[PDB]
Amino acid sequence: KETAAAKFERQHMDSSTSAASSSNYCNQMMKSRNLTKDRCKPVNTFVHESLADVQAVCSQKNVACKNGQTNCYQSYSTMSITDCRETGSSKYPNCAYKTTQANKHIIVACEGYVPVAFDASV
Numbered sequence: 816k817e818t819a820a821a822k823f824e825r826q827h828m829d830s831s832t833s834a835a836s837s838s839n840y841c842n843q844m845m846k847s848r849n850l851t852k853d854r855c856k857p858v859n860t861f862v863h864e865s866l867a868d869v870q871a872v873c874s875q876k877n878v879a880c881k882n883g884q885t886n887c888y889q890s891y892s893t894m895s896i897t898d899c900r901e902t903g904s905s906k907y908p909n910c911a912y913k914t915t916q917a918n919k920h921i922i923v924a925c926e927g928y929v930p931v932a933f934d935a936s937v
Contacts, residue, residue, distance in 0.1 A: 819931035823923075826850065827933050828869060829861040834895050834916050841899035841912035855901050855910035860933055862921060863895035873925035880934050886924050887934050893918040896936050 817825070825848055835841075841859075850856040862869050872890045880887040898915040905911040917936070924932035 819926070820929045823930045823932065824866070826856075826859060827862055827930075828866060829863050829897070830865050833863055835861075835863075835897040835914050838914050840897055840916075841914040842910075844897075845899055845910060845912055851907070851910040853907075855905055855907045857901045859899045860921075860936055861897045861899070863897065868894070869921070869923070870929050872921060872923050873928050873930060878922060880922075880924055884924065886926060887922050888925055889922045889937065890920045892920070894921055896921065898936070 829844065840861075844861060845851050845856065845859060850859060872888050874888075875891050876889040877885070878887050878889045879885060896917060896919050898917070899912045900915075902911045902913055919936035921936050922934040923930040924934055
């Protein structure tokens, strides 16, 4: 087991770098965060901000989640984020990702009161 709060941190936090430094960021990070262990996770976003800044989103703008639940929150500010998406030819065990770096608002689901899912960036 792993708590949902802990899994969110593992899948979505990268407070160590201000941005992706190269187009290989996703290949490296998806591997090192255990997101390619038994299958390639198709889509994943890393947030280049402090843990405190991301947890704080849970007390910012309340919005609907994609699934219609009401426990999502949108960050007031843009944050540095890296979107990772599995390439068309990627085949487990050799997972391959496109890296996109941008400054976007994030939307997280919160429960309990901390983030437990990444809903989207805007």
